[PDB]
Amino acid sequence: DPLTPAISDRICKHMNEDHASAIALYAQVFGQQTDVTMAQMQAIDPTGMDLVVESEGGSKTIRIEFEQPLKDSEDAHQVLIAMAKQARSVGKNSAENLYFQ
Amino acid sequence: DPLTPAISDRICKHMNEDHASAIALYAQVFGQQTDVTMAQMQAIDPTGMDLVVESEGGSKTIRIEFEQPLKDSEDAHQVLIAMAKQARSVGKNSAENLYFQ
Amino acid sequence: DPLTPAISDRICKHMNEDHASAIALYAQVFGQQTDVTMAQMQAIDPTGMDLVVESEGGSKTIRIEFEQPLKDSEDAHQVLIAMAKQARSVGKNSAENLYFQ
Amino acid sequence: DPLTPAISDRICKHMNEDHASAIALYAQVFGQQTDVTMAQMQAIDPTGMDLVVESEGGSKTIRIEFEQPLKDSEDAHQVLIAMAKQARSVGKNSAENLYFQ
Ligand SMILES: [Zn+2]
Ligand SMILES: [Zn+2]
Ligand SMILES: [Zn+2]
Ligand SMILES: [Zn+2]
């Protein structure tokens, strides 16, 4: 059930390998990062995730706190996939809301 | 001043008697050990240290490898103290790097 | 002793967090990639290491085979640190031995 | 058909009879198990499959979570075969671009 640091290590590796676009998208939307070229997960725990975010001339580490705490490892992948969808939707709505002085 | 079995014993005794919180921190942070009941140094050598950890009634030996070989015995205490500061400081974000879903 | 998949993951995670510039360097010199923005270790085993390299173009996986197989897991770090030195020291002699046609 | 425990029983049974080398391959690659004697599927459900893995020493149960939940309208025999291919394929990407120190 609970999220051992070894399962965090495995979740992060899986997401870095097979969902690098979802992580850039987390960093862009929840991370409010701009000209994000790439992003990797470094840790996940029940309250949030550590992302390393590369811009066109440097890198930083950000934290994204979850609205809901992560109960069980067995859910983490379905929740991260749902956050990637939610992030798609919120990025779409924001990009639409451009006004000019 | 090469590190010997004798010196190792004494370093371990000192850290166990006087720096018990530091060893738990090592096990928790570097060793990724969760719900840890006891942690003690068993041995130290130039390249690393061996820890015995009780998590759930059961015990294992974990090894933490140093980023750098210890030059000599006289460096051990100052490296272990610094390593306890280093461990207290993993996770920590600039603040400007904290966001929310 | 034996380099396990679990230890591979730990070495790669360490190298990606503490030595990212070293891995970019491996991709550059050992991996003859010239355009390299960044690079992550994906796996390490006794005979070599697997890298994801990002060029402006995009991403690719490469493998670098060690000259001598890793004797064990505890040798990995000192071998990687030495390879980073090997790698930084390729543009050497030529520096003082410039001649003109 | 949707995955009832009676359906799991027949899928596992066939895999365990006709595809034991695939089940061992799941456990070695996906499951990161080494020195595996053999391995059996004990159960499969929309989100993953439970394997029993035996090593020289003893046995252990692992779970492998599917990228996509199974939709029943998609077969599983064919899906597990795809997973068998994808497992042999892991590493092959990187080992195609082999370099030497
Ligand atoms: Zn002291
Ligand atoms: Zn290091
Ligand atoms: Zn079949
Ligand atoms: Zn996935």
Numbering used by the authors:
A (entry chain BBB), B (entry chain DDD), C (entry chain AAA), D (entry chain CCC): 3 to 103
What does the paper say about this structure?
Looking at the sequence conservation of these residues, we observe strict conservation of His16 and His21 (numeration based on the Synechocystis protein sequence) throughout different phyla, with the exception of GBP. Radius of gyration (Rg) values from Guinier analyses and molecular weight estimations confirm that Dri1 without heme remains monomeric and heme-bound Dri1 is dimeric. Dimensionless Kratky plots further indicate that binding to heme decreases protein flexibility. We used homology modeling and docking analyses to predict candidate residues for a heme-free Dri1-SdhB1 heterodimer. However, mutations of the metal-binding site residues (His16Ala, His21Ala, or Glu76Ala) led to loss of an interaction, suggesting their involvement in complex formation. Therefore, under low cellular heme availability, Dri1 binds to SdhB, preventing SdhB docking to the membrane-bound domain HdrB.
Using a phylogenomics-based approach and complementary structural techniques, we identify a family of dimeric hemoproteins comprising a domain of unknown function DUF2470. The heme iron is axially coordinated by two zinc-bound histidine residues, forming a distinct two-fold symmetric zinc-histidine-iron-histidine-zinc site. Given the ubiquity of proteins containing homologous domains and connections to heme metabolism across eukaryotes and prokaryotes, we propose that DRI (Domain Related to Iron; formerly DUF2470) functions at the molecular level as a heme-dependent regulatory domain.
